[PDB]
């Protein structure tokens, strides 16, 4: 069964309006990444799988930004996040990458040969 890998507050940049808002996110080891206006039902404001996604780091316009990029059909999806320190960013990007890598291993076990 599915377990929480990491949860906590992130600053998420809006997709239409590129302002930053605080969101409480939970990452689960099936790849679910779900974000709420408040600490958790009430529907989440964000809900997407990190499976088959890529992580990017950037420092502009905000230092300690990371981006999750998912290529899906024709669309590539980007979800942009900020935290207050580079150590905090590494906690999140390591957690997400580890979950994605677990799922990639599983995919390879299914597809190959």
Curated annotation (Swiss-Prot):
Listed result of changing residue 18 to Q: Loss of membrane localization
Post-translational modification: Ubiquitinated; undergoes both 'Lys-48'- and 'Lys-63'-linked polyubiquitination. TRAF6-induced 'Lys-63'-linked AKT1 ubiquitination is critical for phosphorylation and activation. When ubiquitinated, it translocates to the plasma membrane, where it becomes phosphorylated. When fully phosphorylated and translocated into the nucleus, undergoes 'Lys-48'-polyubiquitination catalyzed by TTC3, leading to its degradation by the proteasome. Also ubiquitinated by TRIM13 leading to its proteasomal degradation. Acetylated on Lys-12 and Lys-18 by the histone acetyltransferases EP300 and KAT2B. Acetylation results in reduced phosphorylation and inhibition of activity. Deacetylated at Lys-12 and Lys-18 by SIRT1. SIRT1-mediated deacetylation relieves the inhibition.
Coiled coil: none
Consequence of changing residue 15 to K: Loss of membrane localization
Resulting phenotype, residue 23 to A: Impairs interaction with PtdIns(3,4,5)P3 and PtdIns(3,4)P2
Modified residue annotations for N6-acetyllysine: 12, 18
Cellular compartment(s): Cytoplasm; Nucleus; Cell membrane; Mitochondrion intermembrane space
Tissue: Expressed in prostate cancer and levels increase from the normal to the malignant state (at protein level). Expressed in all human cell types so far analyzed.
Domain PH: 3-101
Disulfide linkage: 53-70
Biological role stated in the UniProt entry: AKT1 is one of 3 closely related serine/threonine-protein kinases (AKT1, AKT2 and AKT3) called the AKT kinase, and which regulate many processes including metabolism, proliferation, cell survival, growth and angiogenesis. This is mediated through serine and/or threonine phosphorylation of a range of downstream substrates. Over 100 substrate candidates have been reported so far, but for most of them, no isoform specificity has been reported.
UniProt record similarity statement: Belongs to the protein kinase superfamily. AGC Ser/Thr protein kinase family. RAC subfamily.
Quaternary structure annotation from Swiss-Prot or TrEMBL: Interacts with BTBD10. Interacts with KCTD20. Interacts (via the C-terminus) with CCDC88A (via its C-terminus). Interacts with GRB10; the interaction leads to GRB10 phosphorylation thus promoting YWHAE-binding. Interacts with AGAP2 (isoform 2/PIKE-A); the interaction occurs in the presence of guanine nucleotides. Interacts with AKTIP. Interacts (via PH domain) with MTCP1, TCL1A and TCL1B. Interacts with CDKN1B; the interaction phosphorylates CDKN1B promoting 14-3-3 binding and cell-cycle progression. Interacts with MAP3K5 and TRAF6. Interacts with BAD, PPP2R5B, STK3 and STK4.
Disease: Breast cancer: A common malignancy originating from breast epithelial tissue. Breast neoplasms can be distinguished by their histologic pattern. Invasive ductal carcinoma is by far the most common type. Breast cancer is etiologically and genetically heterogeneous. Important genetic factors have been indicated by familial occurrence and bilateral involvement. Mutations at more than one locus can be involved in different families or even in the same case.
Domain notes: Binding of the PH domain to phosphatidylinositol 3,4,5-trisphosphate (PI(3,4,5)P3) following phosphatidylinositol 3-kinase alpha (PIK3CA) activity results in its targeting to the plasma membrane. The AGC-kinase C-terminal mediates interaction with THEM4.
Name of the featured protein: RAC-alpha serine/threonine-protein kinase
Native species: Homo sapiens (Human)
Taxonomic lineage of the native organism: Eukaryota, Metazoa, Chordata, Craniata, Vertebrata
